[PDB]
């Protein structure tokens, strides 16, 4: 239920690192961490995850606090905007695919990634996002979850 | 000159691998290689570097298609997008720092970074950048050169 939502994120985070988008996967992790530590009913398995996540998280920031980009890890303002610009370019590219492009499992994965990126941005930076912008993002997530269902029911397939 | 530049870009790229931006480090290497192979008669070390770089660029491709964001390594348009977003943001931050911020080595390294990144974009996707954008990119590069000049004279430093 919960450990699944976090598990997805953590999986995607690792994928983003292995491809070389470290800063993105960084925040995805930090996000997954808050996600786990938010459940008052923690379980052995998740606790080990929090630790593993924090360990990685720390190592990453330490190695950057090379010296040109630090600002994306120290300035949550710039980090939020960089994260948003990246997620948005991906999101917008995927909308078009929903119209003309192919409707395969890659799209399904791509849309969940968008949902997690958006979710990450909203969770990590609440008091930094315009009430107008929050709604926008909350809507983009819903849009994903909608066509995601349209795929499971073959409606768009 | 060619040797000097290649060495710089290469050094910058390696710096981005350490931070986590493997995608940026990737395109710099493509650019670096194209630079080294631009000279019909180059030193052995340089050709050896070209080879070294290619083996790396080759390797990087095998690991990537993650399977969602690999659409960056196989698309000249998207790649350019995520490339400009990153470079453009850094460029602005540095423009501000030129005014109030400290005028240390960092500001220097940063300005050079912007020059290579902007030059990497212009080189790699010149046949995909409108005539207007080319001038706009070249202007910023020029501006970097100019400010570096001032920092040397102590006119701004």
């Amino acid at each position: 239920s919960m450990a699944s939502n976090a598990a997805r994120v953590v999986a995607t985070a690792k994928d983003f690192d292995k491809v070389g988008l470290g800063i993105i996967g960084y925040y995805l992790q930090l996000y997954a961490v808050e996600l786990i530590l938010s459940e008052e009913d923690r379980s052995q398995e998740m606790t080990a995850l929090a630790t593993e996540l924090l360990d990685t998280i720390e190592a990453f920031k330490k190695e950057i606090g090379l010296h040109v980009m630090n600002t994306l890890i120290h300035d949550q303002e710039k980090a939020k905007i960089y994260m948003l610009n990246f997620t948005m370019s991906l999101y917008n590219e995927k909308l078009k695919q929903l119209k003309d492009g192919p409707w395969d499992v890659m799209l399904k994965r791509s849309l969940w990634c968008c949902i997690d990126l958006f979710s990450c941005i909203l969770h990590l930076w609440k008091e930094n996002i315009s009430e107008t912008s929050t709604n926008s993002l909350q809507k983009r997530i819903k849009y994903c979850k909608i066509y995601l269902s349209k795929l499971a029911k073959g409606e768009i397939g």
Side-chain angles (χ1 to χ4, degrees), chain A residues 2-157:
Chain A
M2 188 285 110
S4 66
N5 247 239
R8 179 182 49 254
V9 162
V10 179
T12 312
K14 291 182 175 182
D15 271 39
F16 274 78
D17 287 301
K18 182 178 169 292
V19 71
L21 292 174
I23 288 183
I24 313 291
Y26 168 67
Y27 287 116
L28 272 181
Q29 288 165 77
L30 203 48
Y31 168 40
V33 188
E34 310 210 320
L35 221 54
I36 291 168
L37 298 166
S38 74
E39 289 287 288
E40 303 173 296
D41 336 296
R42 286 212 294 169
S43 64
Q44 297 181 295
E45 181 178 45
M46 289 298 98
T47 299
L49 198 39
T51 300
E52 189 163 5
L53 275 164
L54 286 168
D55 195 309
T56 319
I57 283 170
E58 196 162 304
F60 184 96
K61 188 177 179 175
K62 175 175 181 178
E63 227 272 289
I64 293 118
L66 177 67
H67 305 260
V68 196
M69 286 315 123
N70 68 292
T71 15
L72 282 178
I73 308 177
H74 294 307
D75 193 332
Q76 298 307 288
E77 154 83 356
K78 297 177 189 167
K80 180 272 292 294
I81 295 184
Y82 172 68
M83 195 94 316
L84 207 36
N85 276 291
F86 169 92
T87 298
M88 207 53 69
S89 295
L90 159 55
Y91 177 68
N92 286 323
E93 181 251 291
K94 299 298 172 185
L95 281 186
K96 273 165 288 182
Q97 192 180 327
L98 283 175
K99 308 298 145 46
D100 47 278
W103 297 273
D104 44 65
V105 174
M106 187 44 56
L107 185 71
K108 168 187 181 296
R109 278 182 52 210
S110 281
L111 293 178
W112 267 105
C113 182
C114 285
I115 292 176
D116 293 320
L117 293 170
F118 282 132
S119 300
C120 166
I121 294 154
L122 295 163
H123 187 124
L124 293 184
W125 305 293
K126 283 179 282 292
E127 290 52 55
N128 188 41
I129 300 176
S130 171
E131 187 60 32
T132 306
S133 190
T134 297
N135 280 62
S136 303
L137 297 184
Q138 306 184 312
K139 298 289 153 51
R140 293 194 238 278
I141 294 178
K142 191 65 177 190
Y143 196 100
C144 288
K145 305 182 93 75
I146 288 177
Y147 273 95
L148 226 35
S149 188
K150 274 183 165 183
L151 286 180
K153 305 176 186 180
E155 295 177 58
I156 310 304

